[PDB]
């Protein structure tokens, strides 16, 4: 997260922290995600495409720090890792960048809401809010494009949805932003998601409800003039989602 503020899990209690264990025993952070029902976390397919064995993954909920423990956090295994069949990584962008993880604790439970863990509602199919609406993003991603390290504390910031027409402008992204994606950026280009915020939530208030409107997918640089963050347009994937969530 470029700019924005350090925060704690309580202000984003749907936020999931996804890690991978390597051959040694060493565990490193992979991507963000979002709790959309007690047993289900939603993220981005590109997070997993290189190492698709579900066994290697761990999901934390209730977690406000990257490499240390938070009071109230809960650790989960991944019982099903569902990548999107039409996923693809182009030369600049990703397509159908959406993934689902069914989480199970070693003791067989799905997540239990607490002060630090809550679900985030999905939108209605094809229902997205107005362009210029202010939304929230969250993650453990870099605080600057050029950084080598990641912040230890969770951050969040606010960005505004951008029109497709604006988005498809050549000095923006031109052709590469499709209707299954959303753009969002800072009006002065000072705040953004960055490397390591991938898979994370874009949350917007729709009707009166806080809703998961996007999933962090790609952007050129971070907080870079005329290059918005790009997100997977969740409202377009309710059939894909509901098919797998009904088990």
């Amino acid at each position: 997260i470029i700019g924005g503020e350090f925060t704690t899990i309580e202000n984003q209690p749907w936020f999931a922290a996804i890690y991978r264990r390597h051959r040694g025993g060493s565990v490193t952070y992979v991507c963000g995600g979002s709790l959309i029902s007690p047993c289900w976390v939603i993220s981005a397919t590109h997070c997993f495409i290189d190492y698709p064995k579900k066994e290697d993954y761990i999901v934390y909920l209730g977690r406000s720090r990257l490499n240390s423990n938070t009071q109230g956090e809960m650790k989960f295994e991944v019982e099903n890792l569902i990548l999107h069949k039409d996923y693809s990584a182009d030369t600049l962008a990703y397509h159908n960048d959406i993934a689902l993880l069914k989480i199970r604790s070693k003791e067989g439970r799905c997540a239990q809401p607490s002060r630090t863990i809550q679900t985030i509602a999905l939108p209605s199919m094809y229902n997205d809010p107005q362009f210029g609406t202010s939304c929230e993003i969250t993650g453990f991603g870099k605080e600057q494009s050029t950084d080598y390290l990641y912040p230890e504390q969770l951050k969040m910031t606010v960005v505004k949805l951008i029109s497709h027409r604006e988005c498809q402008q050549p000095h923006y992204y031109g052709s590469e932003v499709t209707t299954k994606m959303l753009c969002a950026a800072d009006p002065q280009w000072k705040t953004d998601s960055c490397q390591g915020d991938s898979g994370g939530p874009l949350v917007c208030s729709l009707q009166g409800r806080m809703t998961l409107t996007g999933i962090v997918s790609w952007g050129r640089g971070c907080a870079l003039k005329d290059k918005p963050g790009v997100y997977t347009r969740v409202s377009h994937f309710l059939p894909w989602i509901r098919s797998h969530t009904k088990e």
């Binding site: 490193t28 952070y29 991507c31 590109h46 991938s198 962090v216 790609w218 963050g229």
Partner: peptide, 10 residues
């Protein structure tokens, strides 16, 4: 790895 990925792995 697309040129504009925001993935840790890229």
């Amino acid at each position: 790895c697309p040129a504009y990925s925001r993935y840790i792995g890229c």
